[PDB]
Symmetry: D2
Subunit: 116 residues, 4 copies
């Protein structure tokens, strides 16, 4: 698990459950290629997106589908999604946790990057 | 003046209006002495709290009554209030903006310190 | 105008000055079309991006070049940029402020939407 | 473990390690009584502050000593500490995670409240 996503809900004070997440990797032609996807569990965590072998050096985009989340709760939010774009593994393999804290008109994201 | 407070609402995407704010200065006996207070404006801002002459170096606490704000909107909040505790330092820039972004179970705060 | 962008630096406690900002509008073929751009001022603000007439309902992306900002300060950042993607809606209030608070490995963004 | 504190560093993209945390509870005379303290581990987490029996209804203040943290890293921060004040267990026993994300001139905090 070199890539994990965690999502929290700042309105309910809870994990954000059943949040869809799509990961893209920039290809040689500079387009965004689909790389992995999944949804957060009851704990707000999404594990198993990729493997150490598959998660090579590259520019990755983690799209967290916040609008679908809020609308599934009957709330009309501001943003379409939260996007997190970063270069990964440029100094060799690392483990990445992308965390996001959601409100209807605001979000924050941080990364925790560790060396295994 | 040298101290402004700005409060935003992350749920509604708006200034947080009519929020009570209290500023305290730390006394020699380590207690918190009332210093200044007011309510945020329609723009979520509270100006005119103090003056350059009165705002000396020291430790200050800005207490924002977030609980009343959320209850007035019919929303159940986690915190009793938000508190921002910091040292005023003459070495650094002269004007302090303390900004707070409010959610029912979360808040963020930053300082914008300029000349 | 109807759209302002404000960028703050959480490390130095200051406006984020001379940060490049690009605004895109989503086209019918789902691609991102350049719409407006500029660099933040000494106050961390970028005004005059668009007008009421040009800023129609639709999906917009605000891309903030955070990587260059941090590198110019000699600090190693995590993100390639910060992106804020949202729908402009005529039903809601008329003026949009997109604010971003920057750290090397984190950012926060909020929308202040007023009449 | 009805009360856990987690602290992250937004400058380094890491857990905030060795952060001192002091918890107070408001007493009948309206003063802040020392309740528990500890420091964050290598994972940025502080476990074992209290027990279900001891963690009764009350108003609690969690003081995270952010200034000592930044200064131990040779950085002069703005805030003295981050304070989190909340009523706990007013609708019966809950589990609380208090999370904080730190920068030198800014911090954010959120709560995750679960029912065991
Ligand atoms: O399991 B984990 O690795 C993990 C990671 C992050 C968190 C919390 C993150 C967080 C805290 C405050 C703010 B503010 O702005 C923003 C964020 Cl994103 C937790 Cl509770 C667990
Ligand atoms: B925490 O993640 C966080 C706190 C505050 C703010 C925003 C501050 C701000 C927004 C807008 C204006 B304005 O319209 O002139 C001024 C300020 Cl100081 C954010 Cl984004 C995040």
């Amino acid at each position: 698990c070199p890539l994990m996503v965690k999502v929290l809900d700042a309105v309910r004070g809870s994990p954000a459950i059943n949040v869809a997440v799509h990961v893209f990797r920039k290809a040689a032609d500079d387009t965004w290629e689909p790389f992995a996807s999944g949804k957060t569990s009851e704990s707000g965590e999404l594990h198993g997106l990729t493997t150490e072998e598959e998660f090579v050096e590259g520019i990755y985009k983690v799209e967290i589908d916040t609008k679908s989340y809020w609308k599934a709760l009957g709330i009309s939010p501001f943003h379409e999604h939260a996007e997190v774009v970063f270069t990964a593994n440029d100094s060799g393999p690392r483990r990445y946790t992308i965390a996001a804290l959601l409100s209807p008109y605001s979000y924050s994201t941080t990364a925790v990057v560790t060396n295994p």
